Design a binder for this molecule. Structure first.
Ligand SMILES: CC(C)c1ccc(-c2nccnc2N2CCN(S(=O)(=O)c3cccc(-c4cnc(N)nc4)c3)CC2)cc1
Length: 833
């Protein structure tokens, strides 16, 4: 242990926002044992990285260029503009031309130590991929934009260097609970519920004699369980709960990370309920020992299948993931488990029908995971895989076969699911896990993933007492192998970020619920930023939410506090890249108040929906604006250029409490549209945007929004914001939207025909992916929400997706929705006062 070694680990602590060397809140080896464990994988991957692709992080895809998109090409001709000092020149290019082929089609057109960086960004067009298959190139086409690139020497790989390094029954004694203070009522009653638990499947359950709720309550009882030790499954949780009604909980893994039976004396500080979720599963103990409830415990311990059964079975397998299997359903799946293995789709339900509390049966389960041959051959199906990592499955080998499948994902896809897989670590019974390692693999393999992984992790470590230890050990594994380049970038980012959390907090306090932003408050802000620039704040930091963009110095004059309840900052920066084609500013918001994580989740689903729509050549021009959480109820938000609220547009001359008129929206588009044809573009863009956000929100159950939370770009692109948050209407199709389509109050139109038609395809498109959507929603709710319901709240989505139903009744159901919204018109909007 050098110094060196410490100062490093010190900077590491500073990045993570947690100290993984601290052993104050542990009762065993596991975290430390996971740190040592993760080294081998980290290394393996570090020592395997192609150093120059690593350094240049090409952002590519194996996916076919969508149709829409194809019809935006001259004649197998794509234009590119290169630059060298204050020089330029275009090259015609064909979609399949490699970069190398291009670069050489230039040295011919009149050394190899030169490469194609995109202008303004830290992004590269290198490696063996068709230009069509780079994402920037795809982003350029979508947005009607010209592709601009600089020529310069490759960044040095050496910059990215890493630094070296029994048959008896189970019982538990319940000695007693203790708590420094009570006053919440006066004397009620309370017992302890000991639960043996696997995939949230309760295996066995005992309670204690009631007693009255004194600051201390001893028992002091042995509690015997049905189950025998030998039949305890790896991953079993002793789950201890205190009822009056449910008030505190805490879990103890019964089998440890060396497969030993947990044996001895414990004092487990519990977690409290704040009135079915991932926080309830945790092995973590409450780190706040001053105030927490405390519990105390001692551990001393061939042939075929008849027509209609096959059909009963297949009926069951066909079912959705929320369709509950009866004991019949289960006995059937198990008994015919060999038939079952022939369908990858039957797996969740099959392994949900394993009696894990029986060792002989567990044994048999492994026996048939030995015969993996159909699973292995099957085409990856992220929904199906993802199901094998929720709270229902808590066996190492099951979850491993899932992860096995994710290995075949290319980078492109990993990013789409990165946040949910990170969150899936909540359901892991152990700190080291296939899933953990896979994230760590992939993050270390590709810079882009490695960046979003860093913040996704840090996001939780900063504000999940229940999991911050675990995720911290993992964040460390990453940072220990990601390269000094990136430590530097991160360290800077964190520093910028922390600075701005202070400024944002100091300011919020300096403002009460008077809805006005007084100049001596804007005096304070304007100043504070100067007093930081100046200090302290570095020459340039990399934009999380979009790590292609570097930001440098503030544009103070353009910065402002926002005249909303939360008083968020609205910060604009210059772009530290001297090469970009514009002067448009880099705009970031900061915000204390709401839990930003919920927002990240809805956005990432929104991207999963967009990509689905690509697989059927649909483009609904969502804007999932960038949004990274950073700390307790605080994070950051992308500023979407040339955009206003819809509320803001209604407060025209048509002002505050007296509103709203149907046209208005329309003039604003024309007012802001240079030519009647660009205006024309906008109504297209709008018809689409509207389609997207209508189906999306409906499905996600966030349909019904006041329009101060709905926005639109000058160019016609509408978009919800502030998912916050948390007489109805299924969505915000208000008469002002409808005219512009040209139809109010209840007629019809070319565009409202178009609109209707587009939704119908979109809804249906999503329905072709019911299961994936169901698992994500379900996962979204358990890993990121306040009050939920292991049935009802999650079952919302099966309904909104109209599971059951032929293609027809679905389409019908949706146009009703539309008609509901019209009935109706301005009712709800008005109702918000
Ligand atoms: C930016 C201006 C046009 C604005 C001002 C106030 C409001 C607003 N009005 C009523 C109620 N709430 C409001 N919010 C302002 C701040 N936001 S936010 O910071 O959490 C947020 C969330 C999502 C998107 C945005 C955003 C991004 N880019 C731009 N250009 N504008 C807004 C801002 C919450 C909602 C919306 C937009």
């Amino acid at each position: 242990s050098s110094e060196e070694s410490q100062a490093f680990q010190r900077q590491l602590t500073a990045l993570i926002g947690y100290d993984v060397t601290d052993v104050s809140n542990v009762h065993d080896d596991e975290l430390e044992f996971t740190r040592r464990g993760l080294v081998t994988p980290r290394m393996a991957e570090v020592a395997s990285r192609d150093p120059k692709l690593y350094a240049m992080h090409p952002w590519v895809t194996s996916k076919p260029l969508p149709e829409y998109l194809w019809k935006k090409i001259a004649n197998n001709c794509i234009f590119i503009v290169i630059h060298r000092s204050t020089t330029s020149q275009t090259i015609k290019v064909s979609p399949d031309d490699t970069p190398g082929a291009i670069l050489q089609s230039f040295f011919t057109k009149m050394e190899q130590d030169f490469v194609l960086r995109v202008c303004g960004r830290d992004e590269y067009l290198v490696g063996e991929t068709p230009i069509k298959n780079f994402q920037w190139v795809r982003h350029c086409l979508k947005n009607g934009e010209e592709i601009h690139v600089v020529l310069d020497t490759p960044p040095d790989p050496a910059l990215d260097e890493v630094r070296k390094e029994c048959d008896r029954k189970f019982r538990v004694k319940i000695r007693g609970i203790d708590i420094p203070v009570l006053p919440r009522n006066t004397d009620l009653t309370v017992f302890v519920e000991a639960n043996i638990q696997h995939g949230q499947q309760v295996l066995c359950q005992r309670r204690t004699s009631p007693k009255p709720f004194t600051e201390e309550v001893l028992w002091n009882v042995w509690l015997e369980f049905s189950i025998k030790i030998k039949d305890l499954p790896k991953g079993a949780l002793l789950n201890l709960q205190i009822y009056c009604q449910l008030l505190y909980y805490v879990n103890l893994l019964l089998i440890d990370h060396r497969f030993l039976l947990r044996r001895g004396e414990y004092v487990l500080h519990m977690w409290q309920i704040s009135g079915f979720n991932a926080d309830k599963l945790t092995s973590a103990t409450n780190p706040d020992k001053e105030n927490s409830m405390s519990i105390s415990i001692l551990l001393d311990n061939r042939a075929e299948m008849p027509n209609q059964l096959r059909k009963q079975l297949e009926a069951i397998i066909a079912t959705d993931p929320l369709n509950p299997l009866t004991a019949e359903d289960k006995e059937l799946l198990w008994h015919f488990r060999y038939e079952s293995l022939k369908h990858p789709k039957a797996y969740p339900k099959l392994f949900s029908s394993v009696k894990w509390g029986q060792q002989e049966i567990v044994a048999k389960t492994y026996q048939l995971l030995a015969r993996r041959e159909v699973w292995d051959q099957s085409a990856l199906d992220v929904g199906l895989t993802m199901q094998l990592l929720d709270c229902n499955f808590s066996d190492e080998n099951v979850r491993a076969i899932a992860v096995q499948k994710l290995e075949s994902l290319e980078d492109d896809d990993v990013l789409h699911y990165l946040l949910q897989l990170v969150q899936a670590v909540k359901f892991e019974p152990y700190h080291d896990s296939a899933l953990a390692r896979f994230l760590l693999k992939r993050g270390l393999r590709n810079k882009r993933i490695g960046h979003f992984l860093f913040w996704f992790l840090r996001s939780e470590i900063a504000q999940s007492r229940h999991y911050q230890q675990r995720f911290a050990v993992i964040l460390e594994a990453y940072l220990r192998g990601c390269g000094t380049a990136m430590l530097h970038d991160f360290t800077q980012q964190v520093q910028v970020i922390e600075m701005l959390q202070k400024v944002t907090l100091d300011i919020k306090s300096l403002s009460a619920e008077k809805y006005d932003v007084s100049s001596q408050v804007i005096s304070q802000l304007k100043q504070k930023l100067e007093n930081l620039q100046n200090s302290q704040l570095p020459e340039s930091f990399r934009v999380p939410y979009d790590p292609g963009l570097k930001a440098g110095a503030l544009a103070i004059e353009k910065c402002k506090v926002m005249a909303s309840k939360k008083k968020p900052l609205w910060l604009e920066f210059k772009c530290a890249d001297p090469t970009a084609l514009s002067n448009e500013t880099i705009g970031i918001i900061f915000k204390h108040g709401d839990d930003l994580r919920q927002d990240m989740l809805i956005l990432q689903i929104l991207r999963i929906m967009e990509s689905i729509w690509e697989t059927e050549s649909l483009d609904l021009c969502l804007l999932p604006y960038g949004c990274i959480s950073t700390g307790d109820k605080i994070g950051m938000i992308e500023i979407v250029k040339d955009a206003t609220t819809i509320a803001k547009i209604q407060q025209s001359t048509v002002g505050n409490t007296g509103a709203f008129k149907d046209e208005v929206l329309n003039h604003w588009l024309k007012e802001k549209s240079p030519t009647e044809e660009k205006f024309q573009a906008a109504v297209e863009r709008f018809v689409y945007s509207c389609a997207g956000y209508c189906v999306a929100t409906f499905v996600l159950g966030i349909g019904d929004r006041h329009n101060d939370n709905i926005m639109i770009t000058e160019t016609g692109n509408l978009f919800h914001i502030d998912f916050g948050h948390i007489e109805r209407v299924p969505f915000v199709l208000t008469p002002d939207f409808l005219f512009v389509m040209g139809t109010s109050g209840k007629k019809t139109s070319p565009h409202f025909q178009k609109f209707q038609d587009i939704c119908v395809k979109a809804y249906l498109a999503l329905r072709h992916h019911t299961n994936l959507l169901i698992i994500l929603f379900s996962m979204m709710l358990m890993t990121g929400m306040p009050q939920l319901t292991s049935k009802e709240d999650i079952e919302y989505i099966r309904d909104a997706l109209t599971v059951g139903k032929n293609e027809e009744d679905a389409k019908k159901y949706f146009l009703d929705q539309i008609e509901v919204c019209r009935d109706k018109g301005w009712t709800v909007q008005f109702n918000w006062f």
